[PDB]
């Protein structure tokens, strides 16, 4: 639980850096995914580079019991509840011929319990293929070909990839007959006719304010068996930008939303959305003080290998989210219409893991 909070906290901080760059664009990010991959990379690092990652994340992986709790978290987050709703993968690609440190491979498998993938980067097209094939075979072909793999060179020695796909089954599905086309107000004032689903139900609903003093509402949408849930947060007034909500995001605030919630009868009109986002993690991580990782000589990967000057040639995250009627009367006094840009959060409630989060500017 404590590691799950630390991991999500770091991941929401990386998302904010991704969201502030896009601003007017659709973004889908995995806070757990970026934490899981950088927790693995902590083992490859030493010196100045390791302390940069450890300080920004808020935890050391070699500390006890950080890794056993991290494993127990994946086992927990994974199976048997997820009916091929969620498909995740983490991969560290290293040079095949590169002489690894004596006792790194047994120490990495002892803690995860997986291995660092070995590929020959001199065979450029085959190297790009194996990276894309690993993503395709582990995410059930739901994620489209990587665009970042174009940075794969002969001089490339270390590649980081994290891919996630999610299309969850709702606890209470939205009726198909209730799905109608309605106007969506874009940030630039313009309106678009988008398909919007609707359902009258008892929703976990709360109201919070921004520092500047503005109201924003948070609605909780549960997935089957109450394991996973989706939070939809957006400011009440359309004149208020979604950035005002994004700038104040943290893992503690998301927990406060859940704690302050009350079950209320409402008619919910929410749009259908399908987003795919490939993120180059270089700039969001460099902005968070993790600059050494991508520097030619400054990068300290001495814990993995000391045979050649090592550094991250590519660090990516490709996430795909699908929100429809179902993964595969009722009385209400007021209706909630999500006809303006909104923020979404996919949370694993027993541990408080922020698996997914993003901004839907235009469905």
């Amino acid at each position: 639980s404590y590691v799950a909070h630390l991991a999500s906290d770091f991941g929401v901080r990386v998302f904010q850096q991704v969201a502030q760059a896009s601003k007017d664009r659709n973004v889908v990010f995995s806070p757990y995914g970026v934490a899981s991959v950088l927790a693995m990379l902590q083992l490859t690092t030493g010196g100045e580079t390791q302390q940069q990652i450890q300080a920004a994340m808020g935890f050391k992986i070699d500390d006890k019991g950080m890794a056993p709790a991290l494993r127990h978290l994946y086992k927990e987050l994974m199976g048997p509840w997820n009916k091929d709703e969620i498909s995740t993968t983490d991969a560290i690609f290293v040079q095949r011929d590169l002489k690894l440190v004596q006792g790194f491979m047994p120490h990495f498998f002892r803690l995860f319990r997986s291995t660092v993938k070995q590929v020959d980067f001199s065979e450029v097209e085959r190297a790009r293929f194996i990276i894309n094939d690993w993503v395709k075979t582990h995410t059930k072909g739901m994620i489209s070909h990587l665009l970042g793999t174009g940075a794969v060179d002969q001089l490339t020695r270390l590649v980081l990839v994290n891919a996630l796909y999610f299309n969850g089954q709702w606890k209470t599905p939205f009726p198909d007959s209730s799905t109608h086309r309605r106007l969506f107000h874009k940030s630039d004032g313009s309106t678009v006719s988008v398909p919007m689903m609707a359902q009258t139900n008892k929703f976990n609903y709360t109201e919070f304010t921004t520092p500047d003093g503005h109201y924003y509402d948070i609605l909780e949408l549960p997935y089957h068996g109450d394991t996973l849930s989706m939070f939809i947060a957006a400011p009440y007034e359309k004149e208020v930008p979604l950035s005002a909500l994004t700038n104040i995001l943290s893992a503690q605030l998301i927990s406060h939303w859940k704690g302050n919630m009350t079950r209320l009868p409402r008619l919910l009109v929410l749009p259908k959305f399908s987003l795919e986002t490939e993120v180059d993690l270089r700039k969001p991580l460099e902005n968070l003080g993790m600059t050494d990782m991508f520097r030619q000589f400054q990068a300290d990967f001495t814990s993995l290998s000391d045979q050649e000057p090592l550094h991250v040639a590519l660090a990516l995250q490709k996430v795909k989210i699908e929100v429809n009627e179902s993964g595969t009367a009722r009385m209400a006094p007021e209706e909630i219409i999500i006809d303006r840009p909104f923020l979404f959060v996919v949370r694993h409630n027993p541990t408080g893991t922020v698996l997914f989060m993003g901004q839907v500017m235009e469905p």
């Epitope: 109201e207 009440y236 209320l264 009868p265 009385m331 209400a332 006094p333 007021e334």
Partner: antibody, heavy 121, light 108 residues
Framework: QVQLVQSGAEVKKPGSSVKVSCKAS????????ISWVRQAPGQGLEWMGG????????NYAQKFQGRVTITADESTSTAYMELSSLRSEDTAVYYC??????????????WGRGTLVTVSS | DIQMTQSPSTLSASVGDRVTITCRAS??????LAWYQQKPGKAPKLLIY???SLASGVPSRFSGSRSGTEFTLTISSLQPDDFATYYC?????????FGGGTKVEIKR
């Protein structure tokens, strides 16, 4: 041009069952909610329940549970409200209210003239 | 159950005066508050919905605002037709509850 015509005033002994009607014209009856709000002499307003004619089943206040029965005849375009086990405390003006918004039961724009129900004894 | 408290119970004012009448909820009701006007021997008439939105055909002098869990109905310039009883109603959760009422009288 929405109008809500209610049945005539009634005086009943503290037995007893009183049934008040509410004819609606002109608009879609099936989709919009018709509620019942009462007002005691020299007192405030009190919501009893409401009904969306297409739903069939009415919403009620836990205070009046086991007494009230709210029905709506789609063909007649009239909503009803019967109150059993009447007493001196039920002496009030009964208003018929209609929602401006579809499928919802919150605030009312259209109101009927009122039916006075005197409970005596 | 959300208790609707109205302050004052009785209000005395002159024609052309600014009138402010208060409503209070026992718990948060979002912006889901309606304002009604009632004249003796007449059915209630909706003026304000969603705390500040003005109902169809209702004049400009009528205003609404939200201050946390408190809502105020403002009449900028009081007119002879405005001397009536005013009720606030919440539409957040069931049961739908109304306020105690605030009668607006002629200042003599």
């Amino acid at each position: 041009q929405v109008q809500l015509v209610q049945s005539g005033a009634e005086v009943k002994k503290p037995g007893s069952s009183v049934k008040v009607s509410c004819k609606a014209s002109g608009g879609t009856f099936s989709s919009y909610a018709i509620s019942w709000v009462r007002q005691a002499p020299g007192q405030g307003l009190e919501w009893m329940g409401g009904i969306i004619p297409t739903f069939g089943t009415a919403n009620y206040a836990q205070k009046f549970q086991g007494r009230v029965t709210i029905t709506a005849d789609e063909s007649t375009s009239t909503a009803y409200m019967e109150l059993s086990s009447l007493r001196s405390e039920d002496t009030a003006v009964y208003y018929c209210a209609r929602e401006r918004r579809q499928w919802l039961e919150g605030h009312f724009d259209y109101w009927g003239r009122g039916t006075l129900v005197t409970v005596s004894s | 159950d959300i208790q609707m408290t109205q302050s004052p119970s009785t209000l005395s004012a002159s024609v052309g005066d600014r009138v402010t009448i208060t409503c209070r909820a026992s718990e948060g009701i979002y912006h889901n508050l309606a304002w009604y006007q009632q004249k003796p021997g007449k059915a209630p008439k909706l003026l304000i919905y969603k705390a500040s939105s003005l109902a169809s055909g209702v004049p400009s002098r009528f205003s609404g605002s939200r201050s946390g869990t408190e809502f105020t109905l403002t009449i900028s310039s009081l007119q002879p037709d405005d001397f009536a009883t005013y009720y606030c109603q919440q539409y957040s959760n069931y049961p739908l509850t109304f306020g105690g009422g605030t009668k607006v009288e002629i200042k003599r």
